[PDB]
Every structure is written in C-alpha cells, then in structure tokens.
Symmetry: C4
Subunit: 245 residues, 4 copies
Amino acid sequence: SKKEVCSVAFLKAVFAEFLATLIFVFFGLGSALKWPSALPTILQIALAFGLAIGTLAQALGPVSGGHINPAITLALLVGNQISLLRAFFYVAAQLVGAIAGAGILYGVAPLNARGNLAVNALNNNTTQGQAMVVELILTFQLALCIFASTDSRRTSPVGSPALSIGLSVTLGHLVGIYFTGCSMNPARSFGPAVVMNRFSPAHWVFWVGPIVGAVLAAILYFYLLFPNSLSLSERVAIIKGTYEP
Amino acid sequence: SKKEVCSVAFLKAVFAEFLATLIFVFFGLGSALKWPSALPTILQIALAFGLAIGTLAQALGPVSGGHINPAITLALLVGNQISLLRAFFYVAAQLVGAIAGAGILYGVAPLNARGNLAVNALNNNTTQGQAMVVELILTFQLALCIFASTDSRRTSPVGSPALSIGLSVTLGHLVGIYFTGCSMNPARSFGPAVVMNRFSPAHWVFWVGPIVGAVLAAILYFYLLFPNSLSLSERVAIIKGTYEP
Amino acid sequence: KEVCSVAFLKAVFAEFLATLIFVFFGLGSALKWPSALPTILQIALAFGLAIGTLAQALGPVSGGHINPAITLALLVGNQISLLRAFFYVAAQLVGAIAGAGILYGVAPLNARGNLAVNALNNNTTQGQAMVVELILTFQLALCIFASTDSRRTSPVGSPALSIGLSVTLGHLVGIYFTGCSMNPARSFGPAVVMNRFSPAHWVFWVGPIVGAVLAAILYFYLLFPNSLSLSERVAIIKGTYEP
Amino acid sequence: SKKEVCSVAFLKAVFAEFLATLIFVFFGLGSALKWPSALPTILQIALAFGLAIGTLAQALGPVSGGHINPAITLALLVGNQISLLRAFFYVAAQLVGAIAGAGILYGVAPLNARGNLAVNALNNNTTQGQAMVVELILTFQLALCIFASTDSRRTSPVGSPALSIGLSVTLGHLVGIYFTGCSMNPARSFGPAVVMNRFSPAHWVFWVGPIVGAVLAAILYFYLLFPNSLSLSERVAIIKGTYEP
Ligand SMILES: CCCCCCCCCCCCCC(=O)OC[C@@H](COP(=O)(O)OC[C@@H](N)C(=O)O)OC(=O)CCCCC
C-alpha cells in the first residue's frame, strides 16, 4: 500500500486518469455545444462521447485501467479488483481531470457556442426518480460490458475491448440524452458544473444513478456470474493494496 | 436433462437471456420514441438497436451464448446446436425480459414521449406477405453472420463477433425500418405489444418471418455448408442435453 | 479439377447468394422512402455494413468477392484461377439481378422509383466519373488484398469490418459523382431489372475494374510479390496449383 | 543512411506514404465539398476523414508505417523509432501526395461543388491561439492512440489498430471542424492550399498546432510512460538509420 501508492507506476496510473478524464470531458462537452454553425445532432454527440472513451481506453487503458469514470472506479472497488487507495486517488484525479478539461473548453470556445458548457440537465417533463432509474440502467450496461471486456479469464474472442466499451457509451447517450443529457459518469457531470458555477437540484442524480448502476453491475458479475476463489486474506490484501502490484 | 436444467450455470444462462432482452428492449424502444425534443432519425435508431445487441453480446454472451432472440434460439435448436430444454427456457426468459424492458421504459418515459411505445408496425404501403419476405431476409443475414461468427471451427480471423453481429442488426434496420419498423426478433415485437394491449395485425409476420429466416440460415449453415460429424445418436444427445464431447 | 467439387460448387453459390443479399440491402436502403429520404451517411453505411456482414458470414465459403472487379483483379494478381473467376463473376451478376428483382417485387410503389440504379452527377462527364470510380475501387481492393494476405504479421483487426467500412468510405465521396458503383454487378443488376441502361453504364464496369486491377498489380507484383515460379503461376490459372 | 534510403523497401515506403496521403486528401476534401446536391453534415465528414485513415492504415501501413501525416512522422522522429532521413522523405512525400490528391479532386470536381476545395479556415469567432490549442489537443489524442496501438510491447488486446486510429481522427473532427475545420495534419491543410493559392493568415496554426500536440504526445508516451531500455547511443543509430542490422 505504501509501496503501491509510492510507485512511479502508480504515479503514472494516477496521471493517466487525470489526463484521460481531461481529454474526455473536453471532447464530450465540445461536441455537444450548440454550434450555431451546425447544431450537433443526437447521433453526432453520442458517437463523439463514445469515440472519446474508445480512443482513451485504447491509448491510456494500458496505464491505469482506463476508468475515466468515478462510478466505474467505485464499482471496481466494490468488486474487489483494486485497492482502497487506488480508488480514492483515481476518483480525485477523474474529478480534477473533469474540471480542467471543462476549463480548457471554456477557455477556447467562442462566446457564441459556450452556452452552459453542456452541463447535464433533466428533460423537465422527466422526474428526478425517473432520471435516477434511467441513469442506473445506462451505467449498469456499460459496467457489465466493461467487466466482461477486460476479464483476463474470458475465453471467447474479445474483439476490441476499447471500441466495444466506447460504443457502449454511445449506446448510452442514444437514450440517456433524452432524459438527462446523459451522465453515466459523476466526473462528466461535476466538471461543467464546476468551471461554470451551475449546480441543479437534480445534480445528485448524476452521482447516484451512475454509481449505483455500476456497483450493481460489479456485484452481479464479480460475485454472481464470474466469482473467483481467493482468501479473505487475499481479498483483504486487494483492498489494502498488499496482494501485489 | 435433469443434470442440465438444474445446474447453476443454466440458471445463470436463463437469467442472462432474460437480463439482456430486457435491456435490449429498453434501449431499443427507448431510442425509437418520437422524442418531440428531437425526433430520432433512421440511422439513429438503427445504430441504437445494433449497439445494444453488440454491447449485450460482449457482456453476457459468455454467460448464455446471448441469443436475446427467439428466432435465433429456435434456429440453433433446429441446427442441432442446443438442447430442447435450453430452447424453451431461453425463449420463455426472452419473452418475459422483453415485457419487463417495455415495462421499465413505459414507466420511465415522459407521457409526451411514450406514444405507442415503439411497437412494430407494417407500413400501410406494404403487403403482409411483402412484410413477411423482408423480415425473412433481414433475419436470414443476421442468423448467417451469427453462426459464421460464433463457430469453433472457423480459421479465418473473426475480428469482433459481438461488433460484427451488432452491426448486422443495424444493417437490418436501415432497410427494415421502412417496411415494418424492423422486427427480426419475436420478443422485441411481443414486448411492447404486451405492455400496450394493442398487438395489431400482421404480428404473426413478426413471428414467422424472423423465425423462418433464422431457421433457413441454420439449415444452410449447419447442414448444407459446414455440417458437423456428430454421431447419429450424438445429435439426439444434444437435443436431450446429455451430449458430451 | 475444381468445378467438379462440392467445394467449388458451394463457393459459387456463396457468391450468388451474397451478391443477392448485398444487392437487396444496398438498393432498398437507397430508395426514396417518402417518410424519410435515406440520407448520404445512412446510405453509405447500409452498403458498407452489408459487405462487412456478408464477408464475415459467407467469406469463408468463397472468399466473399461479391464484386466482378475484385474477382478479375485477383485473377490478374494470380490469386485465383480462370474458371474460378469465370463462374464467380457469372454468379455475382446473376445474383445481383436476383437481388434487385426480389426488392423490386417487394418495395412499395411509392418507394420503387429508380430502382437505386447508378447515375451520373449531371455536371459530371464520363471521364471525370471514370477516374473517380477507378479511385473508389482502387482503395477498396487494396484494403481487401492487404486484409486477406496470409503473410500479414501486423494485427489485421477485423478484415470484414475493415473492408465493409472501406465500401462506406467509397460511398461518402462516390455517391455524389455516380451514385457510387464500385461494382459492375451492383450497377448491372438494377439496370437489367428495369431495362434502362445508362449511356454512362460502361463507366460502371471499366472504372471499378481498371482500378481494382491496378491495385492487384500494385500489391501482388510490386508491393508484396511471392516466389511462385513461372510454371507454378500458370497452375494457378489452370486451377491445379496445390501446393 | 545509405543503408536504408537506398533500399527497395524504403523506396516502397516512401512511395506508399505518397500514395496514401494522395488518396486520403482526395477522399477527405472530396467528402467535405459543399455539394448543393446534398450538403455533407458534420458526422458525415467526420466519418469520411476517419474511415479514410483507418482504411489506408490497414492497406498501406505494413509497407511504410502509414503515418500519412507529417506531424506524426516528426513526432516519431522526436520519440525515436525512425531515422532522420526516413522522416525527411516521408514528410516530403506526404506534402507531395497531398498536393497530388487535392489536384486530382480539382480536376474531377464539378464547378458547383468545387469551391474552395475544403481548405482549412478559422472560425471567424475563433482566435488563432484558441484554434491552435484546439489543434494541439486534437492531434495529441490521435498521436497518443497511434503510439499505443502500434507498440510492439503492448500486452493487452489491441483490437483493430487501424479502426481505432481511424475512429480517433473521426473523434477529432467532431470537435475540430467547428474550430478550424479540423486539420490535425499539416499535409491535409497544405495540399488544398497549394492547389487553390489560399494561405489564410492563420495557416501557421495548421502546422504548429498539429506538430506540437504530436511531439508532445510522443515525448510523454516514449520518454515518460513507456520508455525503452535502450539507450544509449543506439538512439543515434536510430537517428542515423544504422540500427539493428
Ligand atoms: C455510425 C458510424 C460508427 C462506426 C462504428 C465503427 C466500429 C466498428 C468496430 C470495429 C472494431 C473491430 C475490432 C477487431 O477486429 O478486433 C479483432 C480482434 C482480434 O482478436 P485476436 O484473435 O487477435 O485476439 C485473441 C482472441 N481469441 C481473444 O479472445 O482475445 O482484435 C484483437 O484483439 C487483435 C487484432 C489482431 C488481428 C490479427
């Protein structure tokens, strides 16, 4: 744990997530601004967020896990895949990341296109609870795809974990956008909300629905469909980050 | 088979065939809703349906084979690929899943969006028989792609079965939406048709079209082009669930 | 020899069958549906995805040419035999006719129009069009040849999807000039089905074939040649090369 | 090095780079013309430019490395793993094919759609600095993904390096077009310019932004994240072109 956190490997892994979430938020928000020029369409926006995740999973996945999402990091914590300290620093990183990325976009978009910087937001004729359950489901399917696409034990041809995973997030947007703007990711939500100093009463849903959805997926997969056999000592070791590097 | 049906893995498989179809119908109908906000276009809808199955195939395929469609399950039966009891259970789980999927969406979509909850629906301009033959074609190429994509034997690079298969679905909507709203799957149709007690006519088309095209592709793939060498009796054994290779 | 084989007979039926479905999907996806006129990207992905799928699905039976221009190219590149090429191109053409027909008999009157036949940009001359078609079919073919080279050591990802998106790419430019053929069978099929042969039709044979053949010679002779010996190359053509 | 510059393969590679850039400029420019017949939309264009690279990468990458972009060539020079001279002819070949490809479209494009020939051009609401940061960031993610997808030491599944790389350029277009019309490639910007005699006052952006972001991605990836054991001065044998005989 002191050994874990005090790796260059770890320092790198923490940096990869910051920079990944930075780049991810830049691109995702940037693609959804109401460019007067040409106003982004549902499909355009959904493939933009997804290709962002596919591209960063591919490019930086090797360095950290390519989590780029506090809900999937907390989930992976629940599923006994990472140490407590990895989860914590990752979430920080993703949140700091999300804010810097939103930061740079604010900085470079014309007055014209800045709008409210693509903050998530309800349909208005959509209720909070609804929002809440839609987001649970959007995130649930993503996590599942994620756990399945990176399981070292998987026997069937995996294809491209990166593109399956990114296109899974475009699928999420293809419905999510109509309910909430589509969060699926507490950091994607936090970022614009900070930077701009815009927080809606519903903002909590963008934290709750994603995390609960991911964690439900983590409990289903890792402990119901494909549990492994380790000792409580080894389980403990994971959480205390002692099990191994 | 007593030992087959009662096994824990089977109980997972049936759960997964249920879980998927539900999630698939959720995203499927949900992306197809006449959102006043921005009407889904046709590429929009097709990509959402394709990436749901692709996603789902990646995620729960290693659990059940991830049929997520009666036509295909039925066709793997006929092709001597699965046991009669995995076939009945798979179909039942699918039909119920689709119902719950239409069910959660119904309760989640705003009244302005709900509409007829994306039920299939032959175009006034087209004969049933007309409809019947395109849903035949549409599920024929899906079936072929699936079998080809998921065969043990195949020596040529398969790439991504899940993404290949997913985009097979998408392709099918690019033509299919124009005649029937693209069925290619008895449960996707039966689902919404149930949550709304408004089945409509030609619905049979949505059963026999897909199932026939599926079955035809089994015939050709498994008995015409790439037959197996299973014993005359070995076949009965896969029918009963006692086969062991 | 070949022909007289259940292997070669299955192949050819594969090419017939694949072209059918390919043509059905391509054309019906390009018809003028009044509820929603098929857009350019929409159309490009229907053609692209059809080939992606058919090659994934039927590719192991035949090699999935689904294109007389490719087949001839392979011949020229010494990758297939003379009879192989004869019978396939044969099959593709009739398979395409078949596919246009099934669609013609199935599309609603208000949709049928055209029937998605290839057709020149009006402000485009046949020579202009000839070069574009050349080019469109050139990139596609070397996508094919590189993606099905057994000597390839670089990870090939998905040859099927790479090749399908290759088609898609051709449409995104090509549709604006010629409606994008890239495939004489594709253009031949609806034309037979609805008489109406264009005065530019030759473009739709010559352009795609020349461009593919150019790519065949580039890749198999200039880029990635084999050792195959004079007499052993001729056995390639006579459909008796083992090795 | 006369060792490699005089090789028949160097020859083939220098030439493929020419051929690939040519075809890539033909297609990207060609897709993005206004075309009154049907104005190309943003995603339409994002996909065209992307599938062009993913295609050409697949086709011609084993011949040359398929850089098709002076910014990524120079970055590969910066991060080591190509020689100075390979870099010179590659960048020379890219600029000539770009011009070569822009010319052939000019020759082929009908009057009412030619324009312009799809030159890059700042948003008038966009600051040259602003546009530069954006281009920096756009090529940075692309260059990062390229390096990650072509690293021989990579262990986790790479999926399709060609289609990832391809979808990465598509990603960068879905934001970049609204800003600079999306360069990410000095050669794409240079080609049409030469042919139309249009060097916008902000031309510098299309080179320096893309080349910085690239080099930056190459420094991080090669020298910080995934450093190679060797070192030392067999690095100058890299530069000199005489390494690993
Ligand atoms: C609307 C427009 C949107 C466009 C969507 C575009 C998305 C298209 C998706 C294409 C991605 C295809 C990915 C794709 O084709 O990936 C294919 C796999 C090949 O698997 P494998 O046998 O090498 O790995 C071992 C395997 N048995 C296992 O199980 O691990 O990629 C790899 O992992 C390596 C590639 C090397 C090839 C020699």
